[PDB]
Amino acid sequence: MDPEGLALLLPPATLATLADSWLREDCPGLNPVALVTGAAPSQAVLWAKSPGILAGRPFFDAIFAQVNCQVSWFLPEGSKLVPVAKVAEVRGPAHCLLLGERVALNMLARCSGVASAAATAVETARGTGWAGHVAGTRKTTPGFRLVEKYGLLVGGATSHRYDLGGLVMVKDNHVVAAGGVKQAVQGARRAANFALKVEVECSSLQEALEAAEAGADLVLLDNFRPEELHPTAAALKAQFPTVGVEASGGVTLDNLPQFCGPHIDVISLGMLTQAAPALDFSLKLFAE
Amino acid sequence: MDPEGLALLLPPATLATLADSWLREDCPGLNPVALVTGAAPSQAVLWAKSPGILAGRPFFDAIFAQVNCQVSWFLPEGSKLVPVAKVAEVRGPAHCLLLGERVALNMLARCSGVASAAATAVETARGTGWAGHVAGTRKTTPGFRLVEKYGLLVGGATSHRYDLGGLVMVKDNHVVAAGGVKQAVQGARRAANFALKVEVECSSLQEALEAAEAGADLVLLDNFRPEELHPTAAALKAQFPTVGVEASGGVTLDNLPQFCGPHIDVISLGMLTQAAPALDFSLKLFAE
Amino acid sequence: MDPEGLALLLPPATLATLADSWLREDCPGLNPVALVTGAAPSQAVLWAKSPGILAGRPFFDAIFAQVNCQVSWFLPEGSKLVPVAKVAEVRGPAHCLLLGERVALNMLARCSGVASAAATAVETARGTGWAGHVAGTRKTTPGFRLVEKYGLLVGGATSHRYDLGGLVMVKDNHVVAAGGVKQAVQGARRAANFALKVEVECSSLQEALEAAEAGADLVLLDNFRPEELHPTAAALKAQFPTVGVEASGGVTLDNLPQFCGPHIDVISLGMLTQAAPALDFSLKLFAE
Amino acid sequence: MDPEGLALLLPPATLATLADSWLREDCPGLNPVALVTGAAPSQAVLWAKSPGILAGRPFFDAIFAQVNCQVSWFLPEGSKLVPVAKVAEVRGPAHCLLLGERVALNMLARCSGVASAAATAVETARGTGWAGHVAGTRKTTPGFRLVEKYGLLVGGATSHRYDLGGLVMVKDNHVVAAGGVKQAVQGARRAANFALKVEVECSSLQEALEAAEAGADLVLLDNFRPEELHPTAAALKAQFPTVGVEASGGVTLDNLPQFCGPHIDVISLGMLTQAAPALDFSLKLFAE
Amino acid sequence: MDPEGLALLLPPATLATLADSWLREDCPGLNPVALVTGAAPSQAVLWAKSPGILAGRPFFDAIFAQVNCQVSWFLPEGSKLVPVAKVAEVRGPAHCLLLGERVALNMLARCSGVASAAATAVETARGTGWAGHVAGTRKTTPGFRLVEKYGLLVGGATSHRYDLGGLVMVKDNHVVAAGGVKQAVQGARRAANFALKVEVECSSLQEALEAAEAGADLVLLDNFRPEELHPTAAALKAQFPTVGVEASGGVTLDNLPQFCGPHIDVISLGMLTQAAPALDFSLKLFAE
Amino acid sequence: MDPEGLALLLPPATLATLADSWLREDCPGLNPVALVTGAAPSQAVLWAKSPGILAGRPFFDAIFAQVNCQVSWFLPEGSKLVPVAKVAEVRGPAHCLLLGERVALNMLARCSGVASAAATAVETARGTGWAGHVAGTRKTTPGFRLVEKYGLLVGGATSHRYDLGGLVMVKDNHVVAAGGVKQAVQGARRAANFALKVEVECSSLQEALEAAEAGADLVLLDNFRPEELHPTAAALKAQFPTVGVEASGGVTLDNLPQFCGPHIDVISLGMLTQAAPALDFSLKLFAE
Ligand SMILES: O=C(O)c1ccc[n+]([C@@H]2O[C@H](COP(=O)([O-])O)[C@@H](O)[C@H]2O)c1
Ligand SMILES: O=C(O)c1ccc[n+]([C@@H]2O[C@H](COP(=O)([O-])O)[C@@H](O)[C@H]2O)c1
Ligand SMILES: O=C(O)c1ccc[n+]([C@@H]2O[C@H](COP(=O)([O-])O)[C@@H](O)[C@H]2O)c1
Ligand SMILES: O=C(O)c1ccc[n+]([C@@H]2O[C@H](COP(=O)([O-])O)[C@@H](O)[C@H]2O)c1
Ligand SMILES: O=C(O)c1ccc[n+]([C@@H]2O[C@H](COP(=O)([O-])O)[C@@H](O)[C@H]2O)c1
Ligand SMILES: O=C(O)c1ccc[n+]([C@@H]2O[C@H](COP(=O)([O-])O)[C@@H](O)[C@H]2O)c1
C-alpha cells in the first residue's frame, strides 16, 4: 500500500548484488576519468527535472554504497515530483561520486517512469469510482524486472504475477497446445494444487464459462472491446459469483476509464512498462 | 555498418550468458504451466504488429537455444517492419517454446523499439542533407546495455562510447571537481594518453575554446539553443578546424533538423533509449 | 502430474547450471585419479539396491552431460524400485564416467529417497480413502530445493509453496510481530492482492475463525492433537465452507491415518525431507 | 579436535557467499510477507527440540548477517543438546529476522543431524576401547558438502577425503578400468607423487596384499563380514606393518562395535550423511 | 602520471570481487592448517627481497580485507624497492593472516615485476631524450589483466589498449581477411566512428601511407629493423603530419634506445608482461 | 604421467568455464573489429617461434570452442618445440577466429613457458643421475593456477600440492604462531588425520629431527646452502629412514645439480613459475 513501506520487500543482499552487476556493466575495468577529478570529498544534489512519482530509493542507495558514497533524502518514496525538485544529496570522494552517477540516474529515471505511469493510470481508474486493481504485466525489460515491478508498486499498481511460478497462467498458446480450455485448466489444476491460482485468458463467453466451470480462479477477458466486455463480465459473474475477472489488451491511459466496470476486478496494461518514458534527473556537484 | 553485418559484433558466449540470466530471472525454479501443454513438437510464428525496424535476432536466437528451440527468420536484421509481418518461425517442444516466449518477445520489443527510434532520427537528419552521425548516449537500462546499444546500431545511429573504459568523457561535474576546464583536460590527457579520445562538455563558446586549446579531440556543446549553437560551432571550428563538435540535450525527433548544421559532426539524443516505445510482437503456435 | 510428465517442469539450462556447480564442488581443480584409468570408451550399469521410487533422471542426465557422457534408461521416472533393479546404463570415456559417478549417485540417492518417503505417505493417506493432498514443507536442504521438491512431486506429494515468492504464508511469528491475527491477514491481503493466496498458521479454533473472517484462503491448524483437529476443522469449515484447511506438525508415516479426515484438505509432513533416508544406488563398469 | 576450534577452518568470505546463495534460493525476488510484520526491532530465541549435538554456528551467524541480524549464543559449538534448550537469541528488524529464519534452521537442523550421528557413532566406537578413527565419506548432499563435513568434524568424526584432489582413491570401478590392482596403483602412484596418499579398496586378501606391495598407503577392506575382516586385517598388517587399513560397507550405528578391531585404523559409515535425520529447531519471537 | 594517484582507477567492489576469486582458487573449502596456529591476534611484516618498483597496494589491501586483516604501508605506491625493505605490516588473527599470505604475495610479486620492467624500460627510453611513450600490449596473463595493466601504469608505462573495445586495432590477420589495407581501414572507420581511434599495423611504407590515407589515426610500424624504421617514420610523418606512429616487435630492454627516434610517438614491448620476472617478497610474523 | 595422458586430468566443464571468463575479460561487450573482416570461413596456422615444450592444448581448444572454432593439432602435448614448428590449424568464421586469437596465444605462451622451464629443470636433475622429483610451488599467478600447474606436469615436474586443501604444509610462520615445531606438528596431525600428509619447513637439523619425531611425513629443509643440506639430510634420514626430504629456496637452473643428492627426494623451485619466460607463438590466416 503506502509507498514508503514497500522498501521492506527488498532483501539488502539482493540490492547490493544487483548494484554490483550494473556498475560492472558500466565500468568493467579501469576508471580513467577518476584521474580528471581526484578523490576529494564532494557533495552533489539529485534534481528532478520531470514531473511524476519518485521511485527507486533502495536501489539508488545500494548503487552509491558500492562506491562508498552516502545519500540523504528530502523526498519520501512515492512522492510526487515537481521540477526542479531537490530530491536528495549524495556525498563521497569525487571520483566515486561520478562513477556511481550514471548508473544511479538510469535506474531511478526508469523506476520512476514506471511508477509515474502506474500512478497516472491508478488515479484515472479511481476517478470512475471503480474499486478494482490496476496491474502491470510480464512485459518487463529482461534483467531489470525487480526494479520495474517495484516501480509499479510505488505507483500504486499491483505487481500481478512476478514470475512463471507465482500463479498458473493459461494463455492463448497454452490452450491451443492443450487442445481446448477444459483440457488446459485440467493440467493447470494439477500444476497449481492448493498453493497457486489458475488464470485462463478467454476469447469468448463460452471459453470464460468453460474456464470457470473447469475450476479457474480468475478469468482474463483478453482484447474485448469494452462494449462487448462488461456484459460478458456480468454474464460470467452471474453464472460464477466467486471467479475473479481481469481485463487486458489494447488498454491505454486515455481509454482506461471505458474498461472500468462493476464486474471487472483487474485491469492490466502493458504500456506501464512498455511505453512509460524515463523521468529526467540530474546530479550536480556543489561547493561547501 | 550494413544492417546484417552488425550481428558479427556479438560473441556468441556473451549471448548464451545473457539469455541464460534472463530466463533465470523469469523462471528461477519449476515451470508449473509446462504440465498444461506437454512437450509435443510445435511451431510458432512471430508476428510484428508495429511498424519500424527489426533488431535483436542474435539475442532472440540465444534465448530459444537455451530452451532447446530453433528459429528460422523470414526477415533480415535491419528490415522495415510493416504490420502484420510474419517475421520468423520457432520450433521445439511445446513447453519449451512457451517458456522462451515472454523473454524473447520482451527483448525484441525493446531492441526493435530502440532501432525504430534511431532509424527515424537518422532519416530526419539525413533528409536535411546533413552529413553527421546521429548518436545515442549512456542512458541505457541497467543490465540491458548490450541490447540497447546493438539496437541503436541496427537503426543506423552510432553507439557512441560503450562505457567509461572508452573515450575519456569530461562532463560539467568533472570540470567543477577538477577546478576548471583546462585543468580537467590536463587530467583527461594523462588518462587517455595516445589511445583514447577526449571529449569535453562545454556550455559556452569560451569554455569550448579552452577545451580545444588544451588538446580536446571533441567538444560537446550542451543544452544550447540552436540559435547559439551554430555561431559557436562555427567560431570554435574556425579557430580549431580539426576538433569534433557534438550537440546534445533537448534534442527530439520533432526538433532535430534545427540542430543539423555544417559545423556539427555529432548529434546525440537521450530520447533514443529513454523515450523509445517498444514494438508489439506476438508469438503464436500453429498447425497443432 | 503423471510421473514421467514431471520432467517437463525443469528448464534444461537450470539443470546444466546445477550439475556444473555440483561437479565443481566435488572436483574444483585437477582430477588425479583420471591417470589411474585412462579414457577408453566404457559403459556402466546403475543398480538400485533399495526398494522405493525412482526420481532424479533429469538431474542425472545433466550431471553426465557435463562430463560428456550419455545415459540410456530402462526404468521410467516414478517407477517402483525392486532390488536389484538394473536401472540405466551410462557410456563415455572411463575417466569421465567415474568423475560423474559420485555426484550423480549422491543426487539420485536423495531425490529418490524423498520420492520414496512421499509415495509411502500418499499410499497410507489414500488407503484410508481420504481425498486430500499429502504435502511437503519448506524444510529442504539449502541449495538442493529443486531436487527435493521435484522428488516430492515424483512420489505423488504436492510441492506446496516453492518459496517466499508464492503464496503469502502467515506463521505464528508473523502474527506475533503483526500484533494479531486479523492485523496480519490485513497485511497479508495487501501483499497477496488478487494473484497470491493467503494461508494462516492457527493453533486454536478462535484464531482459525478470525483468519477466515479477514479473508484467508487457507487455514493451517498447527500442532493439534488429532482429537482437537477434526472438531475444529468441522467448526471452521461449517462457518466458512470455502476456506482450505491444512494440518501439520507431528505427522509421521505411522500416525498419518488419524490426521486423515473429511474437513482436512492438506496434510504436510516435515518428515518427507528431514527424515527421508536416501536410496542405495551403485554404478558399475562392465564388458571391459 | 575440540569442537569450538573447528570454526577456524572456515574462511569468512566463503560463509558469506554461501549464506547468500541459500537466501537467494529461498527468496529470489520480493519478500511479500515483509509487509505483514514491518521492520520493528525484534528478538527471537532458537529452541532445540531434538537431542543431539549442536553444529553449524558459523553458517548460522553468516545467514543472519546477510539480513542484518545478530546472534548471541548460549551453547558452544559441539554441545550436547537437550530439549527444550534455549540455544541462542537472534535480534534485528522483524521482517529481516523472519526472512533469515527458514534458511538458518534448515542449515542448522542438518548440520546438527550429521554431527549427532557422528558423535553417537564415535562414542559407541570408543566404548570398545578401539583407538581408531570413525570417518564420513563422499556420500554428501551435492552443493552442501561444506556444511556436512563440518558437521562430521563437530561430532568428532574425521572428514576423510573432502574432494577428488585430496588423496588418490582407487575404487572397484577404477581397478577394473585399469586392468587389475597393480596396474591401478601404478597410475595412482604417478598421480599422487609425494604430496597425496593412495588408498585402494580391495575385495580379497590377495588384492589387499597386491595393493600394499604396489605401494598403497592405505587399504580399504570393503564390504567384509567382520568375521572375515579382522583376520584379513591382521594378515595384511603382518606382511605390511605401516599400511593403513580402513573398513567400510554395510556399517551401522548398531553393528559398528563388531567392526572395531586392533588391525583396523579407520571405519567409515555412509549413514552418517545418508541416513542422519535432521534435528528439530524452532525460532520464536518474544517481547522485550 | 604520479604512481600514488593511479589507485583511483580501481573501483573498490572490483577489487573485492577479484580478491575473493583468488582466495577461493587457493582454498576452495576448508583451511586445515588454521588448526595449527589458532586465531590469536598477530602481526607480520612484508619484506621486499628483490630490487624494483612497488606496485599493487590496492589489490593487496583488498585480499587481506577479505580475511579480516589490516595493512599499514611504509612505502608509497611506485616507490623504488631496495632489499631488504620493510614494505608494510599486516595485522589480524594468525590463521587469517596466513591464509591471505600466499595469494597476496603472488599478486604483489607479479604486479611489481611488471611495474619494475616498465620503469626500467621507461627510464632507458628517457635517457635518449626521446619524448615518446613506452607502452605495454595485450600479451597479458588471462584473468589477470587488471593487475598487469595497473603494474604497467605504476611503472610509468601507458596501458595501450585495455581491451578489444578501446580502439579499433587493425592487425596483420585483419588486413588479410579484409583483402588489403584500404578495405580494412574502411570497415575500421565504420566501426570506430568518432568515439574510437583506428590503428593499423603496416609491413611496408606503402601500407603505412595507404593506412594514413584511408583515415588511420595511428600507424603501427611492426617488426622493422631500426635502420629501416626511422626513415619510414619520417617519410610517413612528412606526407602525414598528424598521424601517430607506433613501433613494436623484437623490442627489448637492451635494444630499446635504438628504437627511440623523433618520428616515433610510441614504442610497445611484449616483454613487459611476457618476460618480466616476479619480485621476491616474504611475510614473516613477529612478536609484540 | 606420460605427456598426452595429462590432458585427462581436466574436466571439460572446468575448461569451458575458464575459457569463457578469459574471453569475457578480453571483450566484455561489443567486438567492433569484427566489421573489419566479416565472417567468411577461414583457417589459420599456429606457429611456435620459440624452442621448448608444448602445453595448453585443452585450454586452447576450449577457448576456440567458445567462439565456435575448431582446432586440428599436428604436434602432441609434451612435444619438443623447434622453430618454426607448424603446430596446429584453426578453422572458423574470420571474425571469430580473430576474437579467439589473443587469449589463446596468451594462454599457450604461458603454459608452454612453464612446461619449458620445468622440462629443462628435470633434464638437469636427471642428467646428474639423481632419482628424485623436481617440483613446483604455490607461487602461481592468481586465477591462472590450473594452467600453470598443468604446464608444470607436462614438463615432467610434479605439481606438488595443488592448494591448502591437500597436504598440511607447516611453514616457519605456522611454527612461530604455534609457539614451536612439535606443537605445530601436533596441530598439523589433527588437521591431517589419516588422509593428508604433513610437511614441515625446517631451517636446521634439530628442527628437522623434532618434526620427524612428532610424526611429520615430510621435512622441508629451506634456504640451506648445499654444503649444510646433505649432511643434514643424511642425518635426519639416518634417524628416520621413512621421512621424505624436500629442498627448496635459492634453487635455479644453473645451480640445480648441487642440490641433487641421495638423501633428497624433492627439489622445488619458485623459478618454474616466477621466472619462466613465455614462448612466442603467432596465429596466421592463410589460403584467403
Ligand atoms: O503473463 C502475465 O504476466 C500477464 C498478466 C497480465 C496480462 N498479460 C498479458 O498481457 C497482455 C496485455 O498487453 P497490452 O500490452 O496489450 O496491455 C494480454 O494480452 C495478456 O495476454 C499477461
Ligand atoms: O557518457 C557518454 O558516453 C555520453 C555520450 C553521449 C551523451 N552523453 C550525455 O547526454 C547528455 C544529454 O542527453 P539527453 O538527450 O538525454 O538530454 C549530455 O549532457 C551528455 O553529457 C553521455
Ligand atoms: O513455508 C512453507 O511453504 C511451508 C509449507 C508447509 C508447511 N510449513 C511449516 O511446517 C511446519 C511443521 O512441519 P513438520 O512436519 O516438520 O513439523 C508448520 O508449522 C508449517 O508452518 C511451511
Ligand atoms: O570416496 C571416498 O570419499 C570414500 C571414503 C570412504 C568410504 N568410501 C566408500 O563408501 C562406501 C561406504 O558406504 P556405506 O554407505 O556402505 O557405509 C564404501 O563402499 C567405499 O567405497 C568412499
Ligand atoms: O593488440 C594490441 O593490444 C597491441 C598493442 C601494441 C602492440 N601489439 C602487438 O604486439 C606485438 C609486440 O610484441 P613483442 O612481444 O614482439 O614486443 C606487435 O607485433 C603488435 O602486433 C598489440
Ligand atoms: O604451499 C605449497 O604447496 C608449497 C609447495 C612447495 C614449496 N613452497 C614454498 O616455496 C618456498 C621457496 O621457493 P622458491 O623457489 O620460490 O624460493 C619454500 O619456503 C616453501 O615453503 C610452498
Author numbering:
A (entry chain A), B (entry chain B), C (entry chain B), D (entry chain A), E (entry chain A), F (entry chain B): 1 to 288
Paper text:
In Homo sapiens, Rattus norvegicus, and Sus scrofa, QAPRTases were reported to exist as hexamers. Although several QAPRTase structures have been determined as a result of extensive crystallographic studies, structural information regarding the reaction mechanism of QAPRTase in higher eukaryotes, including mammals, is limited due to the lack of a structure in complex with a reactant or product. Here, we report the 2.1 Å resolution crystal structure of Sus scrofa QAPRTase (Ss-QAPRTase) in complex with NAMN. Our results represent the first crystal structure of a mammalian hexameric QAPRTase with its reaction product and may provide structural information useful for understanding the mode of binding of NAMN with eukaryotic QAPRTases and for designing drugs specifically targeting the QAPRTases of pathogenic bacteria rather than those of mammals.
